[PDB]
Short mmCIF file of C-alpha atoms and ligand atoms in Angstrom, two decimals:
data_model
loop_
_atom_site.label_atom_id
_atom_site.label_comp_id
_atom_site.label_asym_id
_atom_site.label_seq_id
_atom_site.Cartn_x
_atom_site.Cartn_y
_atom_site.Cartn_z
CA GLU A 9 14.28 -11.70 34.67
CA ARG A 10 14.25 -10.48 31.05
CA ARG A 11 12.23 -11.81 28.10
CA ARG A 12 12.73 -15.48 27.30
CA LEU A 13 14.14 -16.71 23.99
CA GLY A 14 14.32 -20.46 23.41
CA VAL A 15 17.24 -21.76 21.36
CA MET A 16 17.29 -25.23 19.80
CA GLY A 17 20.47 -26.30 18.08
CA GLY A 18 20.78 -29.35 15.85
CA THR A 19 22.00 -30.93 12.62
CA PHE A 20 18.33 -31.21 11.49
CA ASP A 21 19.03 -33.81 8.85
CA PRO A 22 16.16 -33.96 8.77
CA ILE A 23 14.21 -32.05 11.36
CA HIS A 24 11.35 -34.23 12.64
CA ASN A 25 8.30 -34.11 14.88
CA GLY A 26 10.37 -35.13 17.91
CA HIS A 27 12.39 -31.90 17.70
CA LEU A 28 9.28 -29.83 17.10
CA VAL A 29 7.09 -31.28 19.88
CA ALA A 30 10.02 -30.78 22.34
CA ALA A 31 10.40 -27.12 21.37
CA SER A 32 6.61 -26.63 21.50
CA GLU A 33 6.19 -28.18 24.97
CA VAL A 34 9.13 -26.19 26.35
CA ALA A 35 7.79 -22.96 24.81
CA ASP A 36 4.55 -23.58 26.71
CA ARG A 37 6.03 -24.77 30.03
CA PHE A 38 8.48 -21.80 30.17
CA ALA A 39 6.32 -19.09 28.50
CA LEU A 40 8.95 -18.54 25.80
CA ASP A 41 7.58 -16.06 23.23
CA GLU A 42 9.92 -17.43 20.53
CA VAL A 43 12.08 -20.51 19.84
CA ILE A 44 15.10 -20.01 17.56
CA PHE A 45 16.13 -23.11 15.64
CA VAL A 46 19.84 -23.15 14.76
CA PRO A 47 21.07 -25.71 12.21
CA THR A 48 24.75 -26.50 12.80
CA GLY A 49 27.43 -25.68 10.21
CA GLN A 50 29.13 -28.40 8.12
CA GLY A 56 32.11 -40.59 8.39
CA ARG A 57 28.45 -39.98 7.49
CA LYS A 58 27.91 -37.42 4.73
CA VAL A 59 25.88 -34.67 6.43
CA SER A 60 23.44 -33.06 3.98
CA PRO A 61 24.46 -29.58 2.71
CA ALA A 62 23.80 -26.73 5.14
CA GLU A 63 21.39 -24.98 2.77
CA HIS A 64 19.14 -28.08 2.62
CA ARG A 65 19.20 -28.48 6.41
CA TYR A 66 18.40 -24.80 6.84
CA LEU A 67 15.58 -24.84 4.30
CA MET A 68 13.98 -28.01 5.72
CA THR A 69 14.08 -26.39 9.16
CA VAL A 70 12.53 -23.19 7.75
CA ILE A 71 9.76 -25.19 6.03
CA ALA A 72 9.14 -27.31 9.12
CA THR A 73 8.82 -24.34 11.50
CA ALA A 74 7.01 -21.99 9.09
CA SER A 75 3.49 -22.72 10.29
CA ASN A 76 4.24 -22.17 14.01
CA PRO A 77 3.80 -18.48 15.11
CA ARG A 78 6.56 -18.74 17.75
CA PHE A 79 9.30 -20.57 15.77
CA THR A 80 12.14 -18.98 13.77
CA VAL A 81 15.43 -20.19 12.23
CA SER A 82 18.91 -18.59 12.42
CA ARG A 83 21.80 -18.92 9.97
CA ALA A 84 24.30 -18.01 12.76
CA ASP A 85 26.06 -21.41 12.77
CA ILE A 86 25.91 -21.98 9.00
CA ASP A 87 27.34 -18.52 8.23
CA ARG A 88 30.02 -18.59 10.98
CA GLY A 89 32.15 -21.24 9.22
CA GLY A 90 34.30 -23.94 10.78
CA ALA A 91 33.29 -26.15 13.70
CA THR A 92 29.93 -25.34 15.33
CA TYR A 93 30.25 -24.82 19.08
CA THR A 94 27.27 -23.82 21.22
CA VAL A 95 29.33 -21.19 23.10
CA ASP A 96 29.74 -19.33 19.75
CA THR A 97 26.09 -19.84 18.93
CA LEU A 98 25.13 -18.35 22.33
CA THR A 99 27.63 -15.46 21.96
CA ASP A 100 26.11 -14.58 18.54
CA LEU A 101 22.51 -14.72 19.74
CA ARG A 102 23.24 -12.65 22.87
CA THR A 103 24.72 -10.01 20.54
CA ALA A 104 21.58 -10.16 18.31
CA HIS A 105 19.17 -10.14 21.32
CA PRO A 106 21.01 -8.10 24.01
CA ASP A 107 18.06 -7.67 26.43
CA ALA A 108 16.78 -11.32 26.30
CA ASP A 109 17.50 -14.33 28.54
CA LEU A 110 18.42 -17.38 26.41
CA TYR A 111 17.12 -20.91 27.08
CA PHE A 112 19.07 -23.60 25.21
CA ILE A 113 16.93 -26.69 24.57
CA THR A 114 18.64 -30.10 24.56
CA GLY A 115 17.30 -33.68 24.51
CA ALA A 116 18.38 -36.25 27.08
CA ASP A 117 21.12 -37.73 24.85
CA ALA A 118 22.65 -34.33 24.06
CA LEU A 119 22.48 -33.17 27.71
CA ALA A 120 24.30 -36.37 28.79
CA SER A 121 27.22 -35.35 26.51
CA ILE A 122 27.52 -31.75 27.80
CA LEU A 123 30.89 -32.16 29.62
CA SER A 124 32.66 -32.87 26.30
CA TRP A 125 31.46 -29.58 24.73
CA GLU A 126 33.96 -26.81 23.91
CA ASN A 127 34.45 -24.59 26.99
CA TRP A 128 31.38 -26.21 28.58
CA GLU A 129 31.64 -24.17 31.82
CA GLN A 130 31.11 -20.97 29.80
CA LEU A 131 27.69 -22.31 28.62
CA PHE A 132 26.00 -21.48 31.95
CA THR A 133 27.22 -17.88 31.96
CA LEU A 134 25.51 -17.43 28.53
CA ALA A 135 22.20 -19.30 28.93
CA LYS A 136 19.93 -21.50 30.99
CA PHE A 137 19.63 -25.08 29.75
CA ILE A 138 16.48 -27.16 29.48
CA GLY A 139 16.87 -30.92 29.17
CA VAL A 140 13.86 -32.60 27.57
CA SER A 141 13.00 -36.29 27.74
CA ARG A 142 13.59 -38.57 24.78
CA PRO A 143 12.57 -42.27 24.41
CA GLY A 144 15.46 -44.69 24.88
CA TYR A 145 17.50 -42.16 26.93
CA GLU A 146 17.76 -41.39 30.64
CA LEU A 147 17.06 -37.73 31.42
CA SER A 148 19.41 -36.73 34.25
CA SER A 149 21.25 -33.77 35.80
CA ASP A 150 23.42 -35.98 38.07
CA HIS A 151 26.47 -35.92 35.75
CA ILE A 152 26.87 -32.14 36.40
CA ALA A 153 25.77 -32.10 40.10
CA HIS A 154 29.33 -31.00 41.09
CA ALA A 155 29.29 -27.91 38.79
CA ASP A 160 18.20 -22.36 37.92
CA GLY A 161 20.79 -22.95 35.17
CA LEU A 162 19.49 -26.44 34.32
CA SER A 163 15.83 -27.60 34.26
CA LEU A 164 14.62 -31.10 33.31
CA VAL A 165 11.24 -31.38 31.45
CA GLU A 166 8.97 -34.25 30.35
CA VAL A 167 7.78 -33.76 26.77
CA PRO A 168 5.53 -36.07 24.72
CA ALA A 169 7.35 -39.29 23.93
CA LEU A 170 7.88 -39.55 20.16
CA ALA A 171 10.41 -42.27 19.36
CA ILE A 172 11.68 -40.63 16.20
CA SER A 173 15.31 -40.16 15.18
CA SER A 174 16.81 -38.43 12.17
CA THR A 175 18.80 -41.65 11.63
CA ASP A 176 15.62 -43.72 11.34
CA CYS A 177 14.07 -41.06 9.04
CA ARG A 178 17.16 -41.11 6.79
CA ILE A 179 17.21 -44.93 6.68
CA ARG A 180 13.50 -45.19 5.76
CA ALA A 181 13.84 -42.59 3.02
CA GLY A 182 16.92 -44.45 1.74
CA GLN A 183 14.77 -47.62 1.62
CA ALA A 184 11.78 -45.89 -0.04
CA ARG A 185 9.80 -46.47 3.21
CA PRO A 186 7.42 -43.74 4.41
CA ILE A 187 8.43 -40.84 6.65
CA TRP A 188 4.92 -39.36 6.68
CA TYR A 189 3.90 -38.19 10.20
CA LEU A 190 7.41 -38.60 11.64
CA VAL A 191 8.34 -35.30 9.95
CA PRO A 192 6.17 -32.36 8.77
CA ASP A 193 4.46 -32.75 5.36
CA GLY A 194 6.75 -29.98 3.98
CA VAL A 195 9.84 -32.02 4.92
CA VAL A 196 8.45 -35.19 3.29
CA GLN A 197 8.10 -33.15 0.08
CA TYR A 198 11.44 -31.40 0.39
CA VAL A 199 13.20 -34.76 0.99
CA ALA A 200 11.50 -36.46 -2.01
CA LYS A 201 12.03 -33.48 -4.37
CA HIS A 202 15.74 -32.99 -3.62
CA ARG A 203 16.44 -36.75 -3.31
CA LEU A 204 18.30 -36.16 -0.06
CA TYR A 205 18.88 -39.73 1.16
CA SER A 206 18.42 -41.81 -2.00
CA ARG B 10 -7.87 -57.30 -6.79
CA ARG B 11 -7.41 -54.32 -4.45
CA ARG B 12 -5.75 -54.64 -1.03
CA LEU B 13 -7.57 -52.16 1.17
CA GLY B 14 -6.67 -51.20 4.74
CA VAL B 15 -9.54 -50.12 6.98
CA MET B 16 -8.88 -47.93 10.03
CA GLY B 17 -11.97 -47.54 12.14
CA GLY B 18 -12.00 -44.95 14.90
CA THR B 19 -13.77 -42.24 16.85
CA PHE B 20 -11.08 -39.77 15.67
CA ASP B 21 -11.91 -37.11 18.25
CA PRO B 22 -9.47 -35.93 17.21
CA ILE B 23 -7.40 -37.87 14.72
CA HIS B 24 -3.70 -37.63 15.60
CA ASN B 25 -0.27 -38.61 14.22
CA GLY B 26 -0.36 -41.86 16.18
CA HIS B 27 -3.30 -43.00 14.01
CA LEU B 28 -1.72 -41.75 10.80
CA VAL B 29 1.79 -43.17 11.33
CA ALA B 30 0.21 -46.54 12.16
CA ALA B 31 -1.82 -46.54 8.92
CA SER B 32 1.23 -45.35 6.94
CA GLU B 33 3.46 -48.18 8.30
CA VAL B 34 0.70 -50.79 7.79
CA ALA B 35 0.13 -49.55 4.21
CA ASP B 36 3.85 -49.93 3.57
CA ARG B 37 4.41 -53.36 5.18
CA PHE B 38 1.24 -54.96 3.72
CA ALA B 39 1.68 -53.14 0.37
CA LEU B 40 -1.91 -51.89 0.60
CA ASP B 41 -3.33 -49.94 -2.33
CA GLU B 42 -5.37 -47.67 -0.02
CA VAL B 43 -6.29 -47.17 3.63
CA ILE B 44 -9.89 -46.20 4.38
CA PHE B 45 -10.49 -44.31 7.63
CA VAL B 46 -14.01 -44.84 9.02
CA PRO B 47 -15.18 -42.43 11.74
CA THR B 48 -17.80 -44.07 14.02
CA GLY B 49 -21.38 -42.73 14.36
CA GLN B 50 -22.66 -41.13 17.59
CA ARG B 57 -17.85 -39.27 27.28
CA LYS B 58 -19.51 -36.40 25.35
CA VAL B 59 -18.14 -37.42 21.93
CA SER B 60 -17.85 -34.56 19.40
CA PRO B 61 -20.49 -34.43 16.60
CA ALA B 62 -20.00 -36.85 13.69
CA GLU B 63 -19.43 -34.12 11.06
CA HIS B 64 -16.53 -32.51 12.94
CA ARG B 65 -14.88 -35.93 13.44
CA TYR B 66 -15.42 -36.79 9.74
CA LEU B 67 -13.99 -33.47 8.48
CA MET B 68 -10.96 -33.49 10.78
CA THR B 69 -10.19 -36.93 9.38
CA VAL B 70 -10.64 -35.70 5.81
CA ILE B 71 -8.35 -32.70 6.51
CA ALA B 72 -5.72 -34.92 8.22
CA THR B 73 -5.68 -37.56 5.47
CA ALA B 74 -5.91 -35.15 2.52
CA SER B 75 -2.15 -34.85 1.90
CA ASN B 76 -1.51 -38.61 1.84
CA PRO B 77 -1.99 -40.12 -1.70
CA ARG B 78 -3.19 -43.50 -0.28
CA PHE B 79 -5.65 -42.37 2.45
CA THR B 80 -9.42 -41.96 1.99
CA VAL B 81 -12.26 -41.50 4.48
CA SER B 82 -15.67 -43.25 4.35
CA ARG B 83 -18.84 -41.79 5.85
CA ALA B 84 -20.44 -45.27 5.85
CA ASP B 85 -20.87 -45.53 9.66
CA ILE B 86 -21.99 -41.89 9.89
CA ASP B 87 -24.68 -42.36 7.21
CA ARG B 88 -25.87 -45.71 8.62
CA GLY B 89 -26.99 -44.19 11.95
CA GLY B 90 -27.49 -45.84 15.34
CA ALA B 91 -24.81 -47.89 17.09
CA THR B 92 -21.62 -48.42 15.07
CA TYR B 93 -20.66 -52.09 14.82
CA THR B 94 -17.59 -53.16 12.85
CA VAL B 95 -19.45 -56.14 11.29
CA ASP B 96 -21.77 -53.52 9.71
CA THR B 97 -18.79 -51.38 8.62
CA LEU B 98 -17.02 -54.25 6.87
CA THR B 99 -20.18 -55.63 5.18
CA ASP B 100 -20.86 -52.12 3.81
CA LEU B 101 -17.29 -52.02 2.42
CA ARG B 102 -17.64 -55.59 1.04
CA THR B 103 -20.59 -54.26 -1.00
CA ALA B 104 -18.98 -50.93 -2.07
CA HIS B 105 -15.65 -52.60 -2.93
CA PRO B 106 -16.60 -56.17 -3.98
CA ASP B 107 -13.27 -57.13 -5.64
CA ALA B 108 -10.92 -56.26 -2.75
CA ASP B 109 -9.16 -57.88 0.26
CA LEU B 110 -9.92 -56.04 3.52
CA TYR B 111 -7.49 -55.52 6.38
CA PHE B 112 -8.91 -54.00 9.58
CA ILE B 113 -6.18 -52.05 11.39
CA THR B 114 -6.48 -51.81 15.19
CA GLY B 115 -4.13 -50.75 18.00
CA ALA B 116 -3.22 -52.85 21.06
CA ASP B 117 -5.73 -51.19 23.47
CA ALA B 118 -8.63 -52.14 21.15
CA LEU B 119 -7.26 -55.62 20.24
CA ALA B 120 -8.02 -57.25 23.63
CA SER B 121 -11.52 -55.72 23.68
CA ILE B 122 -12.42 -57.29 20.28
CA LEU B 123 -13.86 -60.46 21.92
CA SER B 124 -16.72 -58.26 23.20
CA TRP B 125 -17.56 -56.69 19.80
CA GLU B 126 -21.00 -57.39 18.35
CA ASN B 127 -20.80 -60.73 16.49
CA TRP B 128 -17.00 -60.69 16.77
CA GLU B 129 -16.52 -64.15 15.18
CA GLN B 130 -18.16 -62.83 11.97
CA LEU B 131 -15.42 -60.11 11.72
CA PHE B 132 -12.87 -62.72 10.64
CA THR B 133 -15.08 -64.00 7.76
CA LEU B 134 -15.12 -60.47 6.27
CA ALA B 135 -11.49 -59.37 6.86
CA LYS B 136 -8.00 -60.08 8.18
CA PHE B 137 -6.99 -58.03 11.25
CA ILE B 138 -3.78 -56.08 11.88
CA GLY B 139 -2.76 -55.24 15.45
CA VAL B 140 -0.37 -52.29 15.65
CA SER B 141 1.85 -51.68 18.70
CA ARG B 142 0.91 -48.66 20.91
CA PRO B 143 2.88 -47.08 23.83
CA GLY B 144 1.52 -47.82 27.33
CA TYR B 145 -0.13 -51.14 26.42
CA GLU B 146 1.22 -54.60 25.53
CA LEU B 147 0.60 -56.08 22.06
CA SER B 148 -1.03 -59.40 23.04
CA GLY B 161 -6.87 -64.14 10.48
CA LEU B 162 -4.61 -61.93 12.64
CA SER B 163 -1.18 -60.35 12.04
CA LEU B 164 0.85 -58.16 14.40
CA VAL B 165 3.07 -55.30 13.16
CA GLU B 166 5.51 -52.93 14.92
CA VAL B 167 4.89 -49.24 14.09
CA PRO B 168 6.79 -46.11 15.26
CA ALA B 169 5.96 -45.47 18.92
CA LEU B 170 4.19 -42.12 19.24
CA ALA B 171 2.78 -41.95 22.79
CA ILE B 172 -0.20 -39.83 21.74
CA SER B 173 -3.87 -40.20 22.70
CA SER B 174 -7.00 -38.36 21.55
CA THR B 175 -7.84 -37.94 25.25
CA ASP B 176 -4.57 -36.10 26.04
CA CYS B 177 -5.13 -33.92 22.94
CA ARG B 178 -8.65 -32.93 24.03
CA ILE B 179 -7.28 -32.14 27.51
CA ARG B 180 -4.40 -30.05 26.09
CA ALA B 181 -6.90 -28.22 23.89
CA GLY B 182 -9.23 -27.43 26.82
CA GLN B 183 -6.32 -26.14 28.94
CA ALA B 184 -4.91 -24.02 26.06
CA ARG B 185 -1.73 -26.14 25.86
CA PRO B 186 -0.27 -26.91 22.42
CA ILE B 187 -1.29 -29.89 20.28
CA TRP B 188 1.16 -28.91 17.52
CA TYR B 189 3.07 -31.96 16.18
CA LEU B 190 0.76 -34.44 18.00
CA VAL B 191 -1.97 -33.82 15.36
CA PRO B 192 -1.54 -32.57 11.73
CA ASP B 193 -1.38 -28.76 11.19
CA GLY B 194 -4.86 -28.86 9.58
CA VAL B 195 -6.36 -30.44 12.71
CA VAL B 196 -4.66 -27.81 14.89
CA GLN B 197 -6.39 -25.08 12.77
CA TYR B 198 -9.76 -26.90 12.72
CA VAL B 199 -9.82 -27.51 16.50
CA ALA B 200 -9.06 -23.82 17.23
CA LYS B 201 -11.42 -22.35 14.60
CA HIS B 202 -14.41 -24.48 15.70
CA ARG B 203 -13.46 -24.29 19.42
CA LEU B 204 -14.06 -28.05 19.67
CA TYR B 205 -12.75 -28.82 23.20
CA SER B 206 -12.83 -25.34 24.77
N1 LIG C 301 12.41 -37.46 19.74
C1 LIG C 301 13.06 -36.51 20.40
N2 LIG C 301 12.53 -36.04 21.55
C2 LIG C 301 13.18 -35.08 22.21
N3 LIG C 301 14.33 -34.48 21.90
C3 LIG C 301 14.85 -34.98 20.77
C4 LIG C 301 14.29 -35.98 19.98
N4 LIG C 301 15.13 -36.29 18.92
C5 LIG C 301 16.16 -35.49 19.10
N5 LIG C 301 16.05 -34.66 20.18
C6 LIG C 301 16.96 -33.59 20.56
O1 LIG C 301 16.91 -32.59 19.57
C7 LIG C 301 18.19 -31.92 19.48
C8 LIG C 301 18.65 -31.89 18.06
O2 LIG C 301 19.12 -33.20 17.69
P1 LIG C 301 20.04 -33.38 16.44
O3 LIG C 301 19.39 -32.85 15.23
O4 LIG C 301 20.48 -34.80 16.30
O5 LIG C 301 21.35 -32.52 16.73
P2 LIG C 301 22.68 -32.90 17.50
O6 LIG C 301 23.62 -33.43 16.49
O7 LIG C 301 22.35 -33.94 18.55
O8 LIG C 301 23.28 -31.62 18.27
C9 LIG C 301 22.54 -31.06 19.38
C10 LIG C 301 23.14 -29.72 19.72
O9 LIG C 301 24.34 -29.92 20.51
C11 LIG C 301 25.33 -29.07 20.02
N6 LIG C 301 26.68 -29.65 20.36
C12 LIG C 301 26.97 -30.92 20.02
C13 LIG C 301 28.26 -31.38 20.13
C14 LIG C 301 29.25 -30.53 20.60
C15 LIG C 301 28.92 -29.23 20.98
C16 LIG C 301 29.95 -28.27 21.44
O10 LIG C 301 29.67 -27.12 21.74
O11 LIG C 301 31.13 -28.73 21.50
C17 LIG C 301 27.61 -28.82 20.86
C18 LIG C 301 25.07 -28.95 18.53
O12 LIG C 301 25.73 -27.80 18.00
C19 LIG C 301 23.55 -28.83 18.54
O13 LIG C 301 23.13 -27.49 18.76
C20 LIG C 301 19.13 -32.65 20.43
O14 LIG C 301 19.30 -31.86 21.60
C21 LIG C 301 18.43 -34.00 20.65
O15 LIG C 301 18.71 -34.57 21.93
N1 LIG C 302 -0.72 -43.73 19.24
C1 LIG C 302 -1.32 -44.75 18.63
N2 LIG C 302 -0.56 -45.59 17.89
C2 LIG C 302 -1.17 -46.60 17.24
N3 LIG C 302 -2.46 -46.93 17.23
C3 LIG C 302 -3.19 -46.08 17.97
C4 LIG C 302 -2.71 -44.99 18.69
N4 LIG C 302 -3.75 -44.32 19.32
C5 LIG C 302 -4.81 -45.01 18.98
N5 LIG C 302 -4.55 -46.08 18.17
C6 LIG C 302 -5.52 -47.02 17.60
O1 LIG C 302 -6.19 -46.38 16.53
C7 LIG C 302 -7.56 -46.82 16.47
C8 LIG C 302 -8.49 -45.63 16.55
O2 LIG C 302 -8.59 -45.17 17.92
P1 LIG C 302 -9.83 -44.42 18.50
O3 LIG C 302 -10.12 -43.11 17.88
O4 LIG C 302 -9.62 -44.29 19.99
O5 LIG C 302 -11.05 -45.41 18.19
P2 LIG C 302 -11.97 -46.37 19.07
O6 LIG C 302 -13.07 -45.56 19.66
O7 LIG C 302 -11.07 -47.04 20.07
O8 LIG C 302 -12.58 -47.49 18.14
C9 LIG C 302 -11.72 -48.17 17.20
C10 LIG C 302 -12.62 -48.99 16.34
O9 LIG C 302 -13.22 -50.03 17.14
C11 LIG C 302 -14.56 -50.13 16.76
N6 LIG C 302 -15.35 -50.81 17.88
C12 LIG C 302 -15.17 -50.49 19.18
C13 LIG C 302 -15.99 -51.07 20.13
C14 LIG C 302 -16.97 -51.96 19.74
C15 LIG C 302 -17.13 -52.28 18.39
C16 LIG C 302 -18.18 -53.22 17.92
O10 LIG C 302 -18.27 -53.52 16.73
O11 LIG C 302 -18.95 -53.70 18.83
C17 LIG C 302 -16.28 -51.69 17.47
C18 LIG C 302 -15.01 -48.71 16.46
O12 LIG C 302 -16.18 -48.77 15.65
C19 LIG C 302 -13.78 -48.22 15.69
O13 LIG C 302 -13.90 -48.55 14.31
C20 LIG C 302 -7.73 -47.85 17.57
O14 LIG C 302 -7.55 -49.16 17.04
C21 LIG C 302 -6.62 -47.47 18.56
O15 LIG C 302 -6.18 -48.60 19.29
#
């Protein structure tokens, strides 16, 4: 039972309060002393990695326990969580990793590259998300997976992008820094 | 003529639920400004803390202001008195009182409630938990957040990050409001 590092992977395009409240609640419920946010590397035109990274940095800046890693952005090619977990175990050799996933992402886990290997590298925490069933029953045939209720914020990055594309407000769905960053760099307009 | 939103509340504390509701209303009704009105004085926090949290929370939004009209008036806060005060202080403006679903059903038992609809139009915003049942109804993003849960999280040293604005997180900790 070594020290606990949270890991939250995502496109973060943009990062929103949904992601951040999930990470925060998990950090508290599992006494994580840090959460590492990992934007993924590069139909829909995903915003450039540097913008996704910077928005995530700005969004997490104010929280004492939140940091951001360039591991996936700097690796190049397809982002796979096995590679993300490999990298972070190398960077934090004496820590136990806790990969944080929302209900919709958890439900997809069997399609992930070398998915069996995931549970040799980290423990997984599924968090609730409005409009999705939180469940471990899809991998019942496989304390490597814990399910957690977090505050229900019905926010998606898709909705945030659509609003911003329509000049409709994204205030309070995303941190004030992200509102500014999105307007200044004209990310979805 | 100005189209003013009015969001009355205890705001103990103000949270993103309140703010996202006012933001969406401001957008859909093309309001020039939304005025947040903390009520005057179940141990509710002092008026000045509730006023200043609301000022800090609204500061960054270009279209949000805060009135101390109910604080300065003293005694029991009645929305008929709030709206008449704002009819005086902004005589050439249309008023829109924004209320959630939990408070919408209770309106029939507000002091002189029938007079409310001679001073302003009302906007009911959806809220998680409750059903949304002179008056318009608008869907807003569903943030299942309550002031009560926030106070409870604060008192148990659990995080209120991302449920309330960063400024309110700092203010609540600095002034030890629910500890
Ligand atoms: N409101 C909300 N409340 C609670 N949780 C919420 C949420 N909105 C999103 N989330 C969650 O936040 C996280 C970030 O979402 P989002 O920005 O869309 O990111 P997303 O594209 O869903 O990717 C989630 C993670 O899965 C990894 N993945 C995906 C596909 C394949 C493989 C592989 O190895 O083959 C790995 C990916 O690298 C990333 O780290 C997700 O886990 C999502 O469920
Ligand atoms: N997550 C959420 N999403 C969307 N809306 C949400 C919400 N949480 C609260 N709300 C709403 O935001 C508003 C502020 O909530 P909160 O701080 O709890 O405020 P609250 O104490 O419920 O009072 C709201 C207003 O009603 C007035 N009132 C109440 C009772 C009697 C009378 C009278 O004249 O006799 C007047 C009071 O003066 C204040 O202006 C409410 O309308 C609430 O429903």
